[PDB]
mmCIF file with all atom_site columns, C-alpha atoms in Angstrom:
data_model
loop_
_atom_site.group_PDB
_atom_site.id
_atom_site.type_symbol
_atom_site.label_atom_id
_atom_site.label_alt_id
_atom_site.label_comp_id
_atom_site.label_asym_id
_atom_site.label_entity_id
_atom_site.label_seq_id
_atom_site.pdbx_PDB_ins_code
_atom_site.Cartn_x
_atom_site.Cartn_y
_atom_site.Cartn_z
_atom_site.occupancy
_atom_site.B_iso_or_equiv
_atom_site.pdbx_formal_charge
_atom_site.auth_seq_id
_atom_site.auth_comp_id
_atom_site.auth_asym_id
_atom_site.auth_atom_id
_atom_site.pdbx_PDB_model_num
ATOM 1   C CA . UNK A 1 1   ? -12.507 -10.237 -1.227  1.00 18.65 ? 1   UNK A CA 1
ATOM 2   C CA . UNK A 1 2   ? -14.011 -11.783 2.168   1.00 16.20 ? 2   UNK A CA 1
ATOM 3   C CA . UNK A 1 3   ? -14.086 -8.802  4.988   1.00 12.56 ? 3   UNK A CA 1
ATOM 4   C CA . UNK A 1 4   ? -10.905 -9.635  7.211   1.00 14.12 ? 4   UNK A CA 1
ATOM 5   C CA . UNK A 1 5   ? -9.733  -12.944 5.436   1.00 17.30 ? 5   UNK A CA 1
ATOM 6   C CA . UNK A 1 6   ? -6.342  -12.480 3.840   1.00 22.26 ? 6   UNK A CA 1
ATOM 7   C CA . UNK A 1 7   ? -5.497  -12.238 -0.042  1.00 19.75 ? 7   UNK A CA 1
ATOM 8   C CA . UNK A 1 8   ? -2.339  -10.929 -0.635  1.00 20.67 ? 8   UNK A CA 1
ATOM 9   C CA . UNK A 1 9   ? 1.038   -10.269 0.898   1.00 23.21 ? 9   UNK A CA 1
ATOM 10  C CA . UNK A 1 10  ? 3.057   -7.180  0.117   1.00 23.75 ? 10  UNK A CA 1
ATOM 11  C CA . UNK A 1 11  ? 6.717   -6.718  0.044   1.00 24.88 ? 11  UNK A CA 1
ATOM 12  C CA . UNK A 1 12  ? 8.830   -3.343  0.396   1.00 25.82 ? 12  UNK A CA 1
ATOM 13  C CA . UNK A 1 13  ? 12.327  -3.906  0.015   1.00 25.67 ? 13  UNK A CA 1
ATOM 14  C CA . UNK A 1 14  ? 13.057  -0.646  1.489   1.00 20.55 ? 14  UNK A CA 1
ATOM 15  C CA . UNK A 1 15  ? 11.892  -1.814  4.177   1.00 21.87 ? 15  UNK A CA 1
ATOM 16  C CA . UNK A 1 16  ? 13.958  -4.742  4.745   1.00 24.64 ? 16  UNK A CA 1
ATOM 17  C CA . UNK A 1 17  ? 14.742  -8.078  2.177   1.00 24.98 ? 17  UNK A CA 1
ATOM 18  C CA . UNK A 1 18  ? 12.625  -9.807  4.810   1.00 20.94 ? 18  UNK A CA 1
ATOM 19  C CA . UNK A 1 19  ? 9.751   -7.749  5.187   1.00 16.93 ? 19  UNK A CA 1
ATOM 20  C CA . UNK A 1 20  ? 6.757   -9.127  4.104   1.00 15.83 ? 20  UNK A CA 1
ATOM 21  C CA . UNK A 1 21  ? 2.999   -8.712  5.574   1.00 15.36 ? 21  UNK A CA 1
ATOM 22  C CA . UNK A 1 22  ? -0.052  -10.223 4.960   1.00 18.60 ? 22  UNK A CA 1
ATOM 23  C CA . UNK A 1 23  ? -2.368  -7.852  3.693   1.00 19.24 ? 23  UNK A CA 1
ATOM 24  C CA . UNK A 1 24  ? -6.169  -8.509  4.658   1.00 20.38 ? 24  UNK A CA 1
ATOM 25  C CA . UNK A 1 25  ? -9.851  -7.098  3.901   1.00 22.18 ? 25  UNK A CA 1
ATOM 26  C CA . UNK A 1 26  ? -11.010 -4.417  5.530   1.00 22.85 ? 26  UNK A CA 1
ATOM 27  C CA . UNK A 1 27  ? -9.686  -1.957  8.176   1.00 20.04 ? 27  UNK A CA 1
ATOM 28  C CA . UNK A 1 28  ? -12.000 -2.372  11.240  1.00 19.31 ? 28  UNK A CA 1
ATOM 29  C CA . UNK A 1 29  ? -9.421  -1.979  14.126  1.00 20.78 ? 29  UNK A CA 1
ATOM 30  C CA . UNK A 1 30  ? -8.903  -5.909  14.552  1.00 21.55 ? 30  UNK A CA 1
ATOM 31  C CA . UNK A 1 31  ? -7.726  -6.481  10.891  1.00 19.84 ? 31  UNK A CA 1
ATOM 32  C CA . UNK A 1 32  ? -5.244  -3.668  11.668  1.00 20.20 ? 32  UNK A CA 1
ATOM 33  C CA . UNK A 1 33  ? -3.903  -6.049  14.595  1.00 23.66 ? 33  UNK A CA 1
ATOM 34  C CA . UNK A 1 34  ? -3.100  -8.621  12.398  1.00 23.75 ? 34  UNK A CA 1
ATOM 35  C CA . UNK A 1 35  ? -1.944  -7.140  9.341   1.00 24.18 ? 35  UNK A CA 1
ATOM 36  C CA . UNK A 1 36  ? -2.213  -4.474  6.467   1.00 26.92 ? 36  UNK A CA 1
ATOM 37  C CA . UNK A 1 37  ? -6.350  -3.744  5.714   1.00 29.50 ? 37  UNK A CA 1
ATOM 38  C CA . UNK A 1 38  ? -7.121  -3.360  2.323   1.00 26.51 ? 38  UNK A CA 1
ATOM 39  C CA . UNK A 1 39  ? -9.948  -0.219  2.284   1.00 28.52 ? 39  UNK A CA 1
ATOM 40  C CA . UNK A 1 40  ? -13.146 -1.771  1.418   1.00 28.97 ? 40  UNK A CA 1
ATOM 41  C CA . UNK A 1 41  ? -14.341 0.466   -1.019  1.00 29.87 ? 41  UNK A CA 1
ATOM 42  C CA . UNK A 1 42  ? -11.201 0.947   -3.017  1.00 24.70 ? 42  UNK A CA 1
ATOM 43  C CA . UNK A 1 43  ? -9.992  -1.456  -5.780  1.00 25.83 ? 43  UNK A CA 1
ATOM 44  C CA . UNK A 1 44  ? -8.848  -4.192  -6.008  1.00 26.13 ? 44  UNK A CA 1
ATOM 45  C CA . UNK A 1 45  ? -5.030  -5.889  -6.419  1.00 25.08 ? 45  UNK A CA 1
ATOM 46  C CA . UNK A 1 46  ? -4.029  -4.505  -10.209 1.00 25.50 ? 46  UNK A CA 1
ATOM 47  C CA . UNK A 1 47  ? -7.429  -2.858  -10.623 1.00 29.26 ? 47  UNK A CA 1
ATOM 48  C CA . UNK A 1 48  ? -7.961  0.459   -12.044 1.00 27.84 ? 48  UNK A CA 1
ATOM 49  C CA . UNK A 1 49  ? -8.932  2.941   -9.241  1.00 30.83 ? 49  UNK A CA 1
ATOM 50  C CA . UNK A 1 50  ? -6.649  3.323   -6.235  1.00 31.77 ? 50  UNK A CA 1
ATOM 51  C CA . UNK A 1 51  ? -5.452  -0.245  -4.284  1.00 33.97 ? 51  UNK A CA 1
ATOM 52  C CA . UNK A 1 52  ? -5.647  1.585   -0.664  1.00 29.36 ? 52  UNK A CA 1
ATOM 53  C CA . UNK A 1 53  ? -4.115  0.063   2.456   1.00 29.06 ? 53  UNK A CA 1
ATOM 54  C CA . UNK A 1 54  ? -3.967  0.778   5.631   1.00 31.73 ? 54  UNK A CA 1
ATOM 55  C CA . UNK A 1 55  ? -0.744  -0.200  8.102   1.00 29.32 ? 55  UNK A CA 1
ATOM 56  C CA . UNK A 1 56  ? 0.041   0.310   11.886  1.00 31.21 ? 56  UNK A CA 1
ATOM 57  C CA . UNK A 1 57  ? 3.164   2.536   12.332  1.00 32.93 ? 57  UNK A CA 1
ATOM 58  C CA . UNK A 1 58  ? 3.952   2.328   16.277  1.00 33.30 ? 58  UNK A CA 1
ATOM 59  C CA . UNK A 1 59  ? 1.836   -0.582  17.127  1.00 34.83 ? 59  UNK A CA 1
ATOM 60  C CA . UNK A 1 60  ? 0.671   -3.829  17.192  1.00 33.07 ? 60  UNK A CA 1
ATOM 61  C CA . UNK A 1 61  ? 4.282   -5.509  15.211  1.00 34.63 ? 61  UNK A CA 1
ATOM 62  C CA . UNK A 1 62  ? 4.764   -1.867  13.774  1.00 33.35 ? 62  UNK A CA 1
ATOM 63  C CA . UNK A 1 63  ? 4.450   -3.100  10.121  1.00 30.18 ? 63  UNK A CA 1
ATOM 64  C CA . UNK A 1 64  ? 5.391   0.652   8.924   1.00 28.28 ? 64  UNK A CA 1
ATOM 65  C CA . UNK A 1 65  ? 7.729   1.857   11.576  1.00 28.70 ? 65  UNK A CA 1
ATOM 66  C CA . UNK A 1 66  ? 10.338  2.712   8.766   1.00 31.76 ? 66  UNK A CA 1
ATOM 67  C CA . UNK A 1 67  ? 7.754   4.477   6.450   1.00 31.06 ? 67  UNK A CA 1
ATOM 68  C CA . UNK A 1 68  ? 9.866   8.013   6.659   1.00 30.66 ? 68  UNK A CA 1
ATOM 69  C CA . UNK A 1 69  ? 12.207  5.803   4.308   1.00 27.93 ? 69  UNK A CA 1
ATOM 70  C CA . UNK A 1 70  ? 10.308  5.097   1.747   1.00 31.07 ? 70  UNK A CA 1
ATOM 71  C CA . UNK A 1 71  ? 11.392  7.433   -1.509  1.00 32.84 ? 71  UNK A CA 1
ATOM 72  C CA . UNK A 1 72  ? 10.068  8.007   -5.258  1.00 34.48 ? 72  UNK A CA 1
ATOM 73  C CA . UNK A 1 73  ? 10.641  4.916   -6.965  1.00 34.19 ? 73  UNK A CA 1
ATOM 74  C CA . UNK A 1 74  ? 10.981  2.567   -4.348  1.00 35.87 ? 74  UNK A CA 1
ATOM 75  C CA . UNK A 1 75  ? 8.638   -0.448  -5.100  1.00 33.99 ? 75  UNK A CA 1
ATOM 76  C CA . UNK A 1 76  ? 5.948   -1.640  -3.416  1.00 30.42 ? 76  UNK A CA 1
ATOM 77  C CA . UNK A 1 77  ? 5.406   -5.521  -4.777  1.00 27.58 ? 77  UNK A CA 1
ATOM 78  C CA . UNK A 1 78  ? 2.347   -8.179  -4.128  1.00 29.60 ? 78  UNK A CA 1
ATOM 79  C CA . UNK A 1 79  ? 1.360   -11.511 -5.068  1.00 31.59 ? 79  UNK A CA 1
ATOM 80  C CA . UNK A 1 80  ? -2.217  -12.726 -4.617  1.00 29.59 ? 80  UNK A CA 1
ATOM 81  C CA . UNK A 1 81  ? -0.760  -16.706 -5.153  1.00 25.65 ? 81  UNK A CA 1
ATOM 82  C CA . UNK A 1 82  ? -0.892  -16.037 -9.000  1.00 22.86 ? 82  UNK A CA 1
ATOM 83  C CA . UNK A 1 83  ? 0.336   -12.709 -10.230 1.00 24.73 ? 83  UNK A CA 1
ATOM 84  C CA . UNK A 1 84  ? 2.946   -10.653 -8.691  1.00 26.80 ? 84  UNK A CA 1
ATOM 85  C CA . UNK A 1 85  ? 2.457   -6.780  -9.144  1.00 26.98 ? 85  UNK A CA 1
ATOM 86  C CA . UNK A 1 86  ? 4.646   -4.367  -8.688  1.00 28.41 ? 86  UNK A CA 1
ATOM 87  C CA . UNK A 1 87  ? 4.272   -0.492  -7.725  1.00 30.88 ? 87  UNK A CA 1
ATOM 88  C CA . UNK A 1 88  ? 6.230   1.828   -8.311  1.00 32.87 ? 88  UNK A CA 1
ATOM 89  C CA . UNK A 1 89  ? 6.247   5.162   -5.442  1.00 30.61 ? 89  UNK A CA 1
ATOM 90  C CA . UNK A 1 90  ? 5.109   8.425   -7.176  1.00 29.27 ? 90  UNK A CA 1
ATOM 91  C CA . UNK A 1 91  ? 4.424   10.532  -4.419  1.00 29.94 ? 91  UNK A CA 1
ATOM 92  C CA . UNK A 1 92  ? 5.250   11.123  -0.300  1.00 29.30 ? 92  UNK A CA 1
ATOM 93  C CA . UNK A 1 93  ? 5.642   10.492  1.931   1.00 29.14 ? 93  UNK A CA 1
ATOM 94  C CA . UNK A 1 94  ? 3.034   12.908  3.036   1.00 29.52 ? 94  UNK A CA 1
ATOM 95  C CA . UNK A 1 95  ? 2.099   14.378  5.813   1.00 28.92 ? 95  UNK A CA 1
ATOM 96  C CA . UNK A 1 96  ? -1.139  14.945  6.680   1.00 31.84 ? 96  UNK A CA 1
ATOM 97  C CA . UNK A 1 97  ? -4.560  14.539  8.956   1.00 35.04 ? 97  UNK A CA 1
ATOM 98  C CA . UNK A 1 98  ? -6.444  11.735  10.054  1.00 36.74 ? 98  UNK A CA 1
ATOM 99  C CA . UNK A 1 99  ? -9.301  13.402  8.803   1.00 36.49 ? 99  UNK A CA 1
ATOM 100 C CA . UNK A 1 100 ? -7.264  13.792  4.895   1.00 33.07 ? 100 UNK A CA 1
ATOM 101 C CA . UNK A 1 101 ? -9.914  11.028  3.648   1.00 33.12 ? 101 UNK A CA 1
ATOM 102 C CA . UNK A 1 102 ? -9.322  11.797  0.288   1.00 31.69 ? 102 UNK A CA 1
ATOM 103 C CA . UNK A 1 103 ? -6.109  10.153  -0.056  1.00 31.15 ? 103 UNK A CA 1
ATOM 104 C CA . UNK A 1 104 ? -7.796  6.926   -1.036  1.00 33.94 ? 104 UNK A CA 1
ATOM 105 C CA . UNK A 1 105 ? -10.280 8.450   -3.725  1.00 35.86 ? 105 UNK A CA 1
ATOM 106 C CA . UNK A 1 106 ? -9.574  7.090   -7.390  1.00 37.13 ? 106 UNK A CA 1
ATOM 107 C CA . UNK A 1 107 ? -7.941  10.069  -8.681  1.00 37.65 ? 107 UNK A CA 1
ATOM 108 C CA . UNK A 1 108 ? -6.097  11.662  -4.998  1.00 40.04 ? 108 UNK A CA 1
ATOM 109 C CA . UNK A 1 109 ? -5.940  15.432  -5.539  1.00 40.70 ? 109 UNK A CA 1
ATOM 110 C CA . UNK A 1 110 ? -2.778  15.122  -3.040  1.00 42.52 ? 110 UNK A CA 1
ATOM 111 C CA . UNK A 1 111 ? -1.109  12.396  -5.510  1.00 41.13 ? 111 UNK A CA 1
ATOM 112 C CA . UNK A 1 112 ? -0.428  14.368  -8.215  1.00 42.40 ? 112 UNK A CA 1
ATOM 113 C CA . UNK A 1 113 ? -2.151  12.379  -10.617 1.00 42.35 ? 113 UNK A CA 1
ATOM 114 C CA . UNK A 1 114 ? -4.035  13.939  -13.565 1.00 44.72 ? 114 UNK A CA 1
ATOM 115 C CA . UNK A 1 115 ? -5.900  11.123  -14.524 1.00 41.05 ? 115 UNK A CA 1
ATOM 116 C CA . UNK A 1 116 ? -7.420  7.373   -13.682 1.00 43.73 ? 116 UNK A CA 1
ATOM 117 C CA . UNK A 1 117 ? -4.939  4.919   -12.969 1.00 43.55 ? 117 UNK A CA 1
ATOM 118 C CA . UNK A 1 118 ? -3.736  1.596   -11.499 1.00 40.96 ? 118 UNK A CA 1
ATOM 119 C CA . UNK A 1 119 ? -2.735  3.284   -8.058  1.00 42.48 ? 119 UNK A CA 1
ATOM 120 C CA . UNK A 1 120 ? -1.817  2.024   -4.820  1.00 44.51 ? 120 UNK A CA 1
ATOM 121 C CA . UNK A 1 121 ? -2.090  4.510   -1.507  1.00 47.42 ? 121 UNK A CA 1
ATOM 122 C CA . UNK A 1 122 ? 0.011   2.920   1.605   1.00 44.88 ? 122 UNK A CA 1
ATOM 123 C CA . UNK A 1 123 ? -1.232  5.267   4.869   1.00 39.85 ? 123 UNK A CA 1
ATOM 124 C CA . UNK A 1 124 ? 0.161   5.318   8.389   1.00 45.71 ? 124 UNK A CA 1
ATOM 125 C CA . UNK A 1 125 ? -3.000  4.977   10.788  1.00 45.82 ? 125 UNK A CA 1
ATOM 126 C CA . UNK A 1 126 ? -2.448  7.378   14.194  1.00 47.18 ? 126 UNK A CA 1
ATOM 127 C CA . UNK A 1 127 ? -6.077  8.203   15.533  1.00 46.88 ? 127 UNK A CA 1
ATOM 128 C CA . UNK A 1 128 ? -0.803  13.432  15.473  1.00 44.69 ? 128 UNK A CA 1
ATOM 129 C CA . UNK A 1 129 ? 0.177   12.840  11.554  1.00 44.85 ? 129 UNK A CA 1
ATOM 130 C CA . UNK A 1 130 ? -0.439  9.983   9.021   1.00 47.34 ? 130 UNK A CA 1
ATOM 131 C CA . UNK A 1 131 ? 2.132   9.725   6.402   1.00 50.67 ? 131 UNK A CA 1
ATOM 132 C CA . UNK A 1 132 ? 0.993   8.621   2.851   1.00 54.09 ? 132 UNK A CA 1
ATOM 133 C CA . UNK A 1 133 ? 2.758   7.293   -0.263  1.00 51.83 ? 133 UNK A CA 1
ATOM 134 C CA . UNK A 1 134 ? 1.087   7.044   -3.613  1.00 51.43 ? 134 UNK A CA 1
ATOM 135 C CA . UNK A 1 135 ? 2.327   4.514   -6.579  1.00 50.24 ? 135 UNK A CA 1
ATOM 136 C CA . UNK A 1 136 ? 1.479   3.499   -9.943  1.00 49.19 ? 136 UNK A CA 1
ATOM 137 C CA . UNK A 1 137 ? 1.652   -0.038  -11.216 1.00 49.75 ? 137 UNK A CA 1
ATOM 138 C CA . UNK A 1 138 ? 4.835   -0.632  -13.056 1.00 51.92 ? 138 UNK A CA 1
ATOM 139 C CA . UNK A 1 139 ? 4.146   -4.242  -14.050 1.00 53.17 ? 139 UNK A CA 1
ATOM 140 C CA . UNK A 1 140 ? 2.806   -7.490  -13.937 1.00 53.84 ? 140 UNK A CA 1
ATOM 141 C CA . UNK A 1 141 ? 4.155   -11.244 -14.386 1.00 56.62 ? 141 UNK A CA 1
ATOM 142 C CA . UNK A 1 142 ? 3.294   -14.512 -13.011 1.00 53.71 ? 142 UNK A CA 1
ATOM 143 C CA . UNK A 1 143 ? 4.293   -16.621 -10.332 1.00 50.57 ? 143 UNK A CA 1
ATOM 144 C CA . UNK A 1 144 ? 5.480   -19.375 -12.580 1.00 53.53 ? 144 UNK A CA 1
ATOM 145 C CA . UNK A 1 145 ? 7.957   -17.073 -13.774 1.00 55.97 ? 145 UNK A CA 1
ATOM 146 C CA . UNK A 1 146 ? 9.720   -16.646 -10.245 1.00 56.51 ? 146 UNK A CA 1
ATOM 147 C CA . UNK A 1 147 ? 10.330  -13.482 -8.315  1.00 54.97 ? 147 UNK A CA 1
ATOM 148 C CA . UNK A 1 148 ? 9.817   -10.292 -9.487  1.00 55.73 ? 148 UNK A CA 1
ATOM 149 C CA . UNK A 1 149 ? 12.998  -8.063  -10.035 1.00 58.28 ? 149 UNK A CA 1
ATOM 150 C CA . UNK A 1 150 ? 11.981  -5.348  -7.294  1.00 58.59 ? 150 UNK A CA 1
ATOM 151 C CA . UNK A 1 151 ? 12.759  -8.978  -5.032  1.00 58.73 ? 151 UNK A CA 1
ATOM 152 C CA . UNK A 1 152 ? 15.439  -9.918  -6.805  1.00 56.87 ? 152 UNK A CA 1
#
């Protein structure tokens, strides 16, 4: 991925049927002005690891002003323009410390998960509490086969 260029847009229909956000590399303060940041060092769309990102709660078109809705099982779905994955909530949202930075290891102790993955990690960003979520990846298709259900 290509620090601050866009690759993938996320949907949340809890959130809204028209939600939808670009979500960008990196999470320098001027990527977080212009969408969801992707964490650097954390994998990649589908990957194994933990697919971290990074969203503005109260500023800057408050992307995740409604994250105290999200709920186990809600999905969290992407498309990078040729497969659309979709995530399935686990965990949160939780409450913790700017300072928590081990939300966005591999293997979160805070997630609940026993063992490696294909996680995704959605944080709030206040310099007060963040709130995190943690999902798994549910599935996979393409985008020659149309929407996902989650968008359905």
């Amino acid at each position: 991925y290509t620090y601050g260029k866009p690759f993938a847009v996320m949907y949340i229909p809890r959130l809204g049927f028209t939600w939808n956000k670009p979500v960008l590399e990196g999470t320098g303060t001027e990527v977080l002005k212009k969408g969801l940041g992707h964490y650097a060092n954390t994998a990649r769309l589908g990957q194994k690891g933990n697919f971290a990102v990074a969203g503005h709660r109260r500023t800057y078109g408050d992307p995740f002003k409604d994250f105290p809705k999200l709920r186990h099982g809600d999905e969290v779905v992407l498309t990078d323009g040729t497969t659309w994955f979709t995530y399935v909530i686990d965990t949160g949202p939780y409450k913790t410390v700017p300072t928590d930075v081990e939300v966005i290891d591999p293997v979160p102790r805070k997630s609940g998960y026993e063992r490696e993955g294909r996680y995704l990690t959605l944080t709030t960003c206040e310099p007060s509490h963040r709130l995190i979520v943690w999902a798994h990846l549910d599935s996979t298709q393409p985008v020659e086969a149309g929407k996902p259900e989650a968008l359905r």
